[PDB]
Amino acid sequence: LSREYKLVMLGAGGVGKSAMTMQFISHRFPEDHDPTIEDAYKIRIRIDDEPANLDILDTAGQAEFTAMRDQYMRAGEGFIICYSITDRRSFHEVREFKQLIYRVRRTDDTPVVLVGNKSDLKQLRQVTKEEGLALAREFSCPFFETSAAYRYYIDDVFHALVREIRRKEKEAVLAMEK
Numbered sequence: 570l571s572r573e574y575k576l577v578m579l580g581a582g583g584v585g586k587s588a589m590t591m592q593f594i595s596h597r598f599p600e601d602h603d604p605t606i607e608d609a610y611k612i613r614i615r616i617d618d619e620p621a622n623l624d625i626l627d628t629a630g631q632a633e634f635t636a637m638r639d640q641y642m643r644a645g646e647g648f649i650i651c652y653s654i655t656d657r658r659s660f661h662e663v664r665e666f667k668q669l670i671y672r673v674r675r676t677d678d679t680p681v682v683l684v685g686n687k688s689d690l691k692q693l694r695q696v697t698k699e700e701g702l703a704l705a706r707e708f709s710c711p712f713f714e715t716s717a718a719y720r721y722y723i724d725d726v727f728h729a730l731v732r733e734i735r736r737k738e739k740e741a742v743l744a745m746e747k
């Protein structure tokens with residue numbers, strides 16, 4: 570499919586990675602989505618009047634390693650690190666996923682978007698929005714609070730990540746010209 574952008578959904582179990590993915594690609598909030606299913610999904614979109622083919626890996630399962638995860642961790646061009654605003658532990662695990670990316674890629678410069686999901690569960694919030702914003706400033710990455718239940722800011726997440734990949738790519742082309 571022309572030039573695909575491989576994207577990887579990272580996050581603890583139960584933060585809503587599958588819900589956000591299904592909402593992005595099909596506008597459907599899943600009913601009883603099996604939390605053990607890991608799979609990749611294709612979708613074509615337009616950011617800034619330019620189309621892009623996306624290939625998004627929705628990570629899951631209790632196995633330590635899979636052929637799919639191994640390939641996408643190495644070849645992925647962008648990462649969506651997700652936590653739930655109702656689960657502070659999943660918010661701390663975000664830092665562990667950032668470490669995992671460096672251990673695989675041996676770099677910190679891979680495009681990343683940080684997302685706090687389940688924003689609609691306002692009364693169960695365990696992590697403030699300012700804490701996410703501050704952590705994203707630590708990572709030098711965009712931040713969003715989303716609701717996969719009602720599709721709040723789901724498009725903005727994947728658009729921002731593709732924007733980052735494009736900007737980083739155009740920088741390498743300009744550096745190669747000099």
Ligand SMILES: Nc1nc2c(ncn2[C@@H]2O[C@H](COP(=O)(O)OP(=O)(O)O)[C@@H](O)[C@H]2O)c(=O)[nH]1
Nearest residue numbers: 582583584585586587588604686687716717718
């Ligand atoms: N209220 C609310 N519930 C959510 C949201 N995202 C996911 N969930 C629920 O959280 C549970 C686990 O979500 P899931 O997509 O399977 O998380 P995953 O294991 O990271 O893929 C499911 O029962 C979803 O209905 C959200 O944005 N708002």
Ligand SMILES: [Mg+2]
Nearest residue numbers: 586587604629
């Ligand atoms: Mg899932």
